[PDB]
Amino acid sequence: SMGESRVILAFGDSLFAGYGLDKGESYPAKLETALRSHGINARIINAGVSGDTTAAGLQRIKFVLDSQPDKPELAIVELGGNDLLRGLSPAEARQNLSGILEELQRRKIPILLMGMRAPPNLGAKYQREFDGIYPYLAEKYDAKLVPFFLEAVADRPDLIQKAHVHPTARGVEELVSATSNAVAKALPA
Numbered sequence: 001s002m003g004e005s006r007v008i009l010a011f012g013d014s015l016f017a018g019y020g021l022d023k024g025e026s027y028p029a030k031l032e033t034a035l036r037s038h039g040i041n042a043r044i045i046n047a048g049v050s051g052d053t054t055a056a057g058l059q060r061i062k063f064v065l066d067s068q069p070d071k072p073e074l075a076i077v078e079l080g081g082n083d084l085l086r087g088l089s090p091a092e093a094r095q096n097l098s099g100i101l102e103e104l105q106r107r108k109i110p111i112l113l114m115g116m117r118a119p120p121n122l123g124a125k126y127q128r129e130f131d132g133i134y135p136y137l138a139e140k141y142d143a144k145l146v147p148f149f150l151e152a153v154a155d156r157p158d159l160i161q162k163a164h165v166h167p168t169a170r171g172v173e174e175l176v177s178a179t180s181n182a183v184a185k186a187l188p189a
Contacts, residue, residue: 005043007070011057012078012114016048020161045072053082054096061100065107075104078114078149084130087122094133101141111143
């Protein structure tokens, strides 16, 4: 094929950084290779930062864009999962994401928004509120939306790394039942 590669900014968190994976296994790296089959030679900027909240992304979006030798021709924005994990305000996540999209729009960079979904442990009120910020933002900023970025691994625990283990409340009781004998015996009489 003729010509320089198309530049795509992958702006996200651990899901773009490739946390826990080897060289070239991250989503941006594998997406770059897959686009060849769509007739596209891309150079995907991996701007994934593990642990980034929406506020962290807002804090660095201008710096990341100003650091580019080639202006992105598409920006993929994948943030909010860490706000979820921390139980942070969905309204503030929406505000922070708005600031990121406003900067991209200011520079006339097309946007693809990766939709994030809350797990049920936050409760239905929180989950509905969080989930709704992504279609709202995509409409407001004329961005394309992948409604559920992680949909393809949603029912595939065999495709997810064994990482953090946060017992449920019932899981805690399980651990207490298994370890209280050891604690009682370690406590001097």
